[PDB]
Amino acid sequence: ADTKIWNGMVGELVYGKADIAIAPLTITLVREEVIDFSKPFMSLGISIMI
Amino acid sequence: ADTKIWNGMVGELVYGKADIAIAPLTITLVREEVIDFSKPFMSLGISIMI
């Protein structure tokens, strides 16, 4: 929030160090503005463990 | 297959009659080539009724 720079795999896509990211990367709104996401290959949610 | 003509809500978007389709339209491969889809707002699958 202070420096307005990305990190991680989203950072490497924006600043050019990589060309594609094949990883468990969640489709969110704030990530949608900077990079491009494909159609989802896996569906998930919150679950309960007992 | 014979006439190569789309019918329905998919047809109205291609030939120009309709501006947008808000409907339960399944994201498939064949429909992806002719028109554009957004991210899925609902997720479903095949289930069992007894």
């Binding site: 159609k39 290959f41 896996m42 | 491969l29």
Partner: protein, 49 residues
């Protein structure tokens, strides 16, 4: 294309279940019954013998 040919479903079954150590654990979750068994009334037979 990979979604409609089931190749994503094929990879998910192999990595999650086929490399699973809890082998065929889903079969054990089925059985359920409620009645008296020998374990509840075993001491009465031991007094009888």
């Amino acid at each position: 294309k990979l979604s409609e040919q089931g190749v994503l479903d094929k990879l998910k079954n192999k990595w999650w279940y086929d490399k699973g150590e809890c082998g065929a654990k889903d079969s054990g979750s089925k059985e359920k019954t409620s009645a008296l068994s020998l374990s509840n009334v075993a001491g009465v037979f031991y007094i009888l013998v």
